[PDB]
Structure formats: structure tokens, C-alpha cells
Amino acid sequence: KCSLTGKWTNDLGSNMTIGAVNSRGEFTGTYITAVTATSNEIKESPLHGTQNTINKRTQPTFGFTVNWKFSESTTVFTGQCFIDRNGKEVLKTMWLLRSSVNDIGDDWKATRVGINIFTRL
Amino acid sequence: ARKCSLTGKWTNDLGSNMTIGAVNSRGEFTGTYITAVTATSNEIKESPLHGTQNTINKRTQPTFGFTVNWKFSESTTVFTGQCFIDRNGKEVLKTMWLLRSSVNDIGDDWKATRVGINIFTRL
Amino acid sequence: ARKCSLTGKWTNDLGSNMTIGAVNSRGEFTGTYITAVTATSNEIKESPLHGTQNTINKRTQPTFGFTVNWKFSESTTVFTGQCFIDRNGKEVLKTMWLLRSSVNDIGDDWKATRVGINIFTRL
Amino acid sequence: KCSLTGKWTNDLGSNMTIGAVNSRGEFTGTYITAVTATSNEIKESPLHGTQNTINKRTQPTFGFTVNWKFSESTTVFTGQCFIDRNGKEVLKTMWLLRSSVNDIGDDWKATRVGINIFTRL
Numbered sequence A, D: 001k002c003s004l005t006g007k008w009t010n011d012l013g014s015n016m017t018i019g020a021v022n023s024r025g026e027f028t029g030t031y032i033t034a035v036t037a038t039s040n041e042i043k044e045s046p047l048h049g050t051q052n053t054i055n056k057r058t059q060p061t062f063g064f065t066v067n068w069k070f071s072e073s074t075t076v077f078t079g080q081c082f083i084d085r086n087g088k089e090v091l092k093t094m095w096l097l098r099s100s101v102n103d104i105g106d107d108w109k110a111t112r113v114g115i116n117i118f119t120r121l
Numbered sequence B, C: 001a002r003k004c005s006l007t008g009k010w011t012n013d014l015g016s017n018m019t020i021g022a023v024n025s026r027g028e029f030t031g032t033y034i035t036a037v038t039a040t041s042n043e044i045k046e047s048p049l050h051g052t053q054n055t056i057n058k059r060t061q062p063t064f065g066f067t068v069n070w071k072f073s074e075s076t077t078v079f080t081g082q083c084f085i086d087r088n089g090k091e092v093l094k095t096m097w098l099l100r101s102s103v104n105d106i107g108d109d110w111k112a113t114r115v116g117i118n119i120f121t122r123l
């Protein structure tokens, strides 16, 4: 019963939309971030992911990848959709932001990590 | 320099294998993952993964991310990294991952996420 | 702008409390942490912590890190973050942590590290 | 019997020393990194940490903080000391590098994560 489909916003002011989830748990979406680590102008970017359907849990885990359209980086988020007594949903996620580096010797510094909480609308 | 491509069969440094299919013009790909190690005693099942490669500036060593939707637990893992040509000329994926466990209630969310690394090379 | 200082009693967003003592001229400090939550079935006990604040350029919002040496589990947590003055003028510590569980075999080292955030405010 | 005391090197060519561990599990050390995220010249920097002494485990966990002397950042490492059949030790660790940001709205991008394996030098 906690569904990922909808329009969500996070603590930083970014918004995301997620469409219908198919029977395979696959979904697509859009992400408009309010903040960036680049100096490039932000552009709405696509996202793709899946919800885990094992045991058809009411509060499933999920993951998705945001394919940034204004930088060479990629972010992944994973988390769980929690739904209260009243039907109010929260997604509690963690993410990794992968920057592009030119030299393999600099790989060690390429991955930032953090949390995000999404609520609806 | 060679272009590093994600399509192919890979193995990681713990002996898990994944196969990634063709990457489409939107940077999307599908594959399967067969893990050698596990955080559950349930029998391991090949599981699908889906992700994208970043094609901005058409870099020869692109970043990417994907989600593995495990078929034998309620967890999900995400990986992100970059496809490099290594110093010896081989393709290698340098990745980090978050493994999200399912918790029964929200007050246990703090303990639900593991993190680590993996390096993949082509099989 | 106030200088954000780590000395004091703090509480987090899960009800855990910590107390940090004076910071010496080398940036070192000691404290105690009383966690509201645990991943063990042991009785929680107050545990020591030790860490440092970075004093380079004597920033008024310095970074810092510390290790909590749990006295009721075989695990270790490390925290690192920055002491900020918030938009409302209050001190706030914004931190990230890694909780390292003990495993028995080196093959299981990949599942030993959980990650998360904590924000602390002064009590 | 796996002991943190010694000189170690990691997989990127950084070295560290750790001195005697006291009965409270406390130790001090030094760290000379081979790599940096700053453009400042590298300087050997002190570290302080603890090993967990509960049940006096033969392969203890531990954590420590490196207080960089050439940047405003801090890195913390945590991991476990493993020791094999003939006494060969390896420290398997993960780390968080906290950079300094000027404004609290940029906190989200301040923390990088990675692994490090140390062996005896």
C-alpha cells in the first residue's frame, strides 16, 4: 500500500515525479534538483528504478538512478516507502553521487554520500 | 584511448557476475546479476538490474548507476561508478553500492543501509 | 558570526545524547555518548568518545570527527561533520557516521559497515 | 591478537603509524597521505582513535580520526583488524572525508566515502 507513484519534494526543495509502477516493479520518473555540485545550469533529468515486490510488502524498498542531463555525473538513491495509519507516505532514502574524474588514480574522491527524505506534493 | 563500454559479462572482486545488455540512445540498459555472496540464507536467484550510463559530452569513460531488484529477498541494492580504461588497457568498472534492507518500522530506518565498494572486470 | 563550539551537551534527532568536554589547543576532545537505540540485545551503557576538531585557519564553523568506543557491543562508530551556526543563530552539528560491526570471517567484511546521518542540537 | 600498533601502508601509497594501544583501547598515530582533494601541499597529520576492547576480541573493530594539518577537512576511518593462520594482519576499513563548506545550505555535498585496506609496512 505505500506507493511510489506521485509528485514528491525533499528537504532541500528538489522535486521528483514517479509514474506508474509496473508488475515487474519498474518505474520511470523525472528529477528537478534545487542544488548542484556543478556550475552548469540545472535541467530536469530522467530517472529509472524499481520497487522490490518480494512478499508484496506494504512498505517496499526501492532504488533508482538519476541520469543528470547537465553534468557528467550520476546519482543513485535507495530506500523504503513508509505509510502511516492515515495513508501519509514518506520515502526515506540514502544516495551516492558519482562525479566523473579523468584519471583512474582520482577514483577514490569521486563518490559523495547523503540522505534524503521525500514527502508527497 | 578506447571507449569503455558497459555491455558484456562482468565479474566482481567477490566473484559475483552480472551481464549488461546493449545501451540504448537514452543511455538505458538492462541486465542480470548473480551474486556470489549474500546477506540472507534464502537460496540465491539470478536478479534483474536496470540502469543508465551518462552520455553528457560523450565521454569515453562514462559514469553510470543501476538498481538490482533482488528476487530472493526484500532488499534493493544500488551501484554507481565509472567505466575506466585501466593503466594496463583493460576496461574496469569502479563502483560503490548501497544495500537497503527492509525494516518493519520507521524508527529502525537508521540501521537499514550498508555501503561498500566493488570492482568489476569483463568475463 | 558566533564561533561554533563542540563543548556541551547535545541531543540528536533519535533521542541519543552526547556530552563533549573542553577542546584543547591541538583540537582534541573527549566525551560520553548515551545512545537511545542499539543494534544488539545488550543493555545500553554510556560509552566514551574521542575526537578532534580541525583548527586550520581557525574557522568559526570547523569540521571535526570522533570515534565512539561502545562499552556494550563489539562495534565501533565514527562520526564526522561540521559545527554550523544555523540560519536562526543556534549551533547545530551536521554529521555522517559509519557503524562498523564485528564479523568473524574476512569474507563477510563487505556486510559490516552501515552509514547514516545525524543532526545534533544543544541540550 | 590482531594489533593496530605498527606502520601501515594502503592501497594508494599512503602511510600511517599507530603507537601503543592503552588498556582503554586508545591510540595516537600519524598519517602521511599520498593523495589529496585540496591543492595545498601535503603535511604529515595526527590521528587519534580507539579499538573496541569488549570480550578482548582477537580481531577487534576500531575507528580513528585524521586531523589534517594542510586543509580544513577531517577524515574518519572505521574497520576491523584481521589476522591469519601465520600472523599476517590486514586492516579493512571504510572512511568518510568531510570537507569544509561555508554555508550550511551546501552541507549535502560535503562528505565523500570510500574504502581502504592497510597492510603492514
Ligand SMILES: CC(=O)N1C(=O)N[C@@H]2[C@H](CCCCC(=O)O)SC[C@@H]21
Binding pocket: A010, A011, A012, A014, A033, A034, A035, A036, A037, A038, A068, A071, A072, A073, A075, A095, A097, A114, A115, A116, D108
Ligand atoms: C537533496 C539532495 O540531497 N540532493 C538533491 O536533491 N540534489 C543533490 C544532487 C544533485 C546532483 C546534480 C548533478 C551534479 O551536481 O553533478 S543528488 C543529491 C542531492
Ligand SMILES: CC(=O)N1C(=O)N[C@@H]2[C@H](CCCCC(=O)O)SC[C@@H]21
Binding pocket: B012, B013, B014, B015, B016, B035, B036, B037, B038, B039, B040, B070, B073, B074, B075, B077, B097, B099, B116, B117, B118, C110
Ligand atoms: C560483491 C559485493 O560487495 N556484493 C555482491 O556482489 N553481492 C552483495 C550484496 C547482495 C545482496 C543480496 C540480497 C540480500 O542479501 O538481501 S550487493 C553488495 C554485495
Ligand SMILES: CC(=O)N1C(=O)N[C@@H]2[C@H](CCCCC(=O)O)SC[C@@H]21
Binding pocket: B110, C012, C013, C014, C016, C035, C036, C037, C038, C039, C040, C070, C073, C074, C075, C076, C077, C097, C099, C116, C117, C118
Ligand atoms: C541516531 C543515530 O543515527 N545513531 C545513534 O545515536 N545511535 C545509533 C548507533 C548506535 C550503535 C550502538 C552500538 C551497537 O548497537 O552496535 S550509532 C548511529 C546511530
Ligand SMILES: CC(=O)N1C(=O)N[C@@H]2[C@H](CCCCC(=O)O)SC[C@@H]21
Binding pocket: A108, D010, D011, D012, D014, D033, D034, D035, D036, D037, D038, D068, D071, D072, D073, D075, D095, D097, D114, D115, D116
Ligand atoms: C587511500 C585513501 O582512500 N585515502 C588516503 O590515504 N588519502 C585520501 C584522503 C586524504 C584527505 C587529505 C585532506 C584533504 O584533501 O582535504 S582520506 C581518504 C583517502
Ligand SMILES: *[C@@H]1O[C@H](CO)[C@@H](O)[C@H](O)[C@H]1NC(C)=O
Binding pocket: A009, A013, A014, A015, A032, A033, A034, A121
Ligand atoms: C518544486 O515544486 C514547487 C511548487 O510546486 C516550486 O515552488 C519549486 O520551485 C519546485 N522546485 C524546483 C527545484 O523546481
Ligand SMILES: *[C@@H]1O[C@H](CO)[C@@H](O)[C@H](O)[C@H]1NC(C)=O
Binding pocket: B011, B015, B016, B017, B034, B035, B036, B123
Ligand atoms: C561467474 O561466472 C564463472 C565463469 O563462468 C562461473 O564459473 C561462476 O560460477 C560464476 N559465479 C557465480 C556466482 O555464478
Ligand SMILES: *[C@@H]1O[C@H](CO)[C@@H](O)[C@H](O)[C@H]1NC(C)=O
Binding pocket: C011, C015, C016, C017, C034, C035, C036, C123
Ligand atoms: C537525553 O537527555 C534527556 C534530558 O535529560 C533525557 O530525558 C533523555 O532520557 C536522554 N536520552 C537518553 C537516550 O538517555
Ligand SMILES: *[C@@H]1O[C@H](CO)[C@@H](O)[C@H](O)[C@H]1NC(C)=O
Binding pocket: D009, D013, D014, D015, D032, D033, D034, D121
Ligand atoms: C610510504 O612509506 C614508503 C616506504 O618508506 C615510501 O616509499 C612512500 O613514499 C611513503 N608514502 C608516502 C605518501 O609518504
